[PDB]
Write a protein that binds this ligand. Sequence first.
Ligand SMILES: COC(=O)c1cccc(NS(C)(=O)=O)c1
Lengths: 412, 412
Amino acid sequence: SRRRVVITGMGMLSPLGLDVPSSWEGILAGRSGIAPIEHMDLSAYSTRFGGSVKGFNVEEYLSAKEARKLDLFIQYGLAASFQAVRDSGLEVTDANRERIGVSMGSGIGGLTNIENNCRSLFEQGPRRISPFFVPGSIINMVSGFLSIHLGLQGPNYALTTAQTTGTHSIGMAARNIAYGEADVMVAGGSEMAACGLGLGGFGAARALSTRNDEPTRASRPWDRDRDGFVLSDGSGALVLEELEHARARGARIYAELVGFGMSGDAFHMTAPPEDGAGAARCMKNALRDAGLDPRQVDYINAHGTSTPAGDIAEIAAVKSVFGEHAHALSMSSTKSMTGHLLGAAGAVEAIFSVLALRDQVAPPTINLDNPDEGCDLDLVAHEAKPRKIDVALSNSFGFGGTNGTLVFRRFA
Amino acid sequence: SRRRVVITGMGMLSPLGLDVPSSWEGILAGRSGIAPIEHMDLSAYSTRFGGSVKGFNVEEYLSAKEARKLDLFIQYGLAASFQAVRDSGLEVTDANRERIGVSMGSGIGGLTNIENNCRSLFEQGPRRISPFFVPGSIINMVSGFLSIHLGLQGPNYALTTAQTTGTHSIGMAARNIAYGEADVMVAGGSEMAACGLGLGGFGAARALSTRNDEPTRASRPWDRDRDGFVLSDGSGALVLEELEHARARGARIYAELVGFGMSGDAFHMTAPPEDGAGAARCMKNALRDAGLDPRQVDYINAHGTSTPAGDIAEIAAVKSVFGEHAHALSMSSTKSMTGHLLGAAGAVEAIFSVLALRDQVAPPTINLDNPDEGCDLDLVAHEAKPRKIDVALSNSFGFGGTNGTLVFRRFA
Ligand SMILES: COC(=O)c1cccc(NS(C)(=O)=O)c1
């Protein structure tokens, strides 16, 4: 019978900071982490900026010897996972190791590593392919390398549901705990798709902002002048814990995870439907799961990708789910500042939602100068809004029309 | 209390055939799907063979427009899903479409398209990358495209847990039904890693059989002359359905999925431990989930990959779990014949496990000419064995020490 799941630990790499509090500081100040990309030459690309992780030192977590074998996406997952576990103060013993698992997801996984090894194969032949290519690049190795390093013998898996990976990864880890399969899960995602194939691939789709000359203003969710999403890199991890297990060890509890919703648009491979019908079905699943009256929802951390079609469909989905109460809650897209971390977006945004609850403040949607046709909600334009937040909601929407919703609330 | 989950439809592309009955005819006759890989220069490669899908006609499934947009691994999963849905007799309606979801996974995803779009990027630059590169290539697009073609609005996701993908996909789909989030799920996996990056990547780790001279004898699980796994292509898809829902529409029920177990080894990135302690915990977990005593098990579809470390760890884990019953059960590796479909291994093997229940026969381990040290179990060497099978287990172990077990039971 269903058990309660709380957040005891969190960890992060974002374009705004090398940890949770440095990133959060940035969210509330309305700072941008978007800048021209330097690790490669992008003069042949229509988009030349992104949300880079700045000054990451992997040797704060791992040996240079192991780091050399692993794609940045894994290094980012491990970094945030280590932060989360440390921040929970949990000690892994023989008594508990079978009851602690991990679910860290990614959309694309180790694409830099695959690109480079493709370069070696086409330039020099198959004998130049790294022996570490596969285990150093595949999406499930954040879960595997984390389990090897900490000795987690619990459920060990990884989702790839594109831009919804983070939300789904957290939600299903919660179901693991709630229904007895584990007492603790390390959950979230990591992405690093800032290579030629990513910026080029999203380029060819015409899916990205091309505001090369003002990169900090490019991601402008619900603004009339938005021209696509901003590609960003990073990681989010949370320690999810069964409540009594958290109590029994005097764990500091940030919030409760009360509800998780999934739905498929069954509409289009890449475009969300204009109405947000699938997003609406997903949010309703989440509220029912949480046993809530929708008027209890105080903050929504929107997906808010800064795409024409994506942003407007959220507004419809929300108005549709929350009727007149749509006008009373506060909804923001932190992707105004971080950009879109793809498979990591749901993970870092889950953490912002939990810190919104702890600090009783809605983060801003920056660059929202001229809200677009029908974008007439409290979108927290420009500046953080101190306010009462008892129940917070994090949405994610991805290619394949795959939707995920997380519901958190204050815990007493 | 939990809802019972049965199998009402199954679908497959394998190296043994273009559907289930053809595949299963191969398995029981002990035929091999392994052969030199064609229309592809493997001169510079230590491995020149594997399990191809022979004669696949995607225009039976998709228009040529929509098949050109999609990586072969998506084509293969869609073919298995469409087969499985057809095989179930299920009718999708506005009344049930919110209760039908998809969890089709992949280990590696769209390598072939990454290779080809890479060729474009290096030779000619980023402007030659396909607009459909990203959505044509990412692992969740079997779930995505299937949901769009059939109007499935249920839980829509994808796992990627390396060689455990297929087993985890089916188990977690079963969970979605058992606990009332869906009444039907299409679950399993697909893979097409028979490109340069795949043969090269697994080549570079010396993980592959190089018995180039006798490709049909290369896969020889538990035989003393084994020298690594054979790389194979294809897909498996099962329609999972809540029992009362199947019964109401008078569906043919193949068998019941009664148990699902997971564990992590927390040992090595690619090698299991010697004693299979992790696989042991995973099997124990599945049998507990099924309310089953180990003595009740009759058949095991092994992971049985034909690696030296992997084949022997599995024997130790079967001896540790089953003790005095370990020689009475029958355990064969159908990879002896199909080779290793990686993410799709668990799905076609769940199907072979369901048909071992239907037809009351253990598939052979072919090539088991000389059992190795301590490989003294009933491994069904050379030839299919008719016998009593009430309960059958399917095992999948994966890079990152990610373990998954499914327990099937006869239905009446
Ligand atoms: C996966 O383990 C569970 O116990 C469980 C129980 C109930 C529902 C679910 N849904 S999910 C997490 O697979 O999306 C899982």
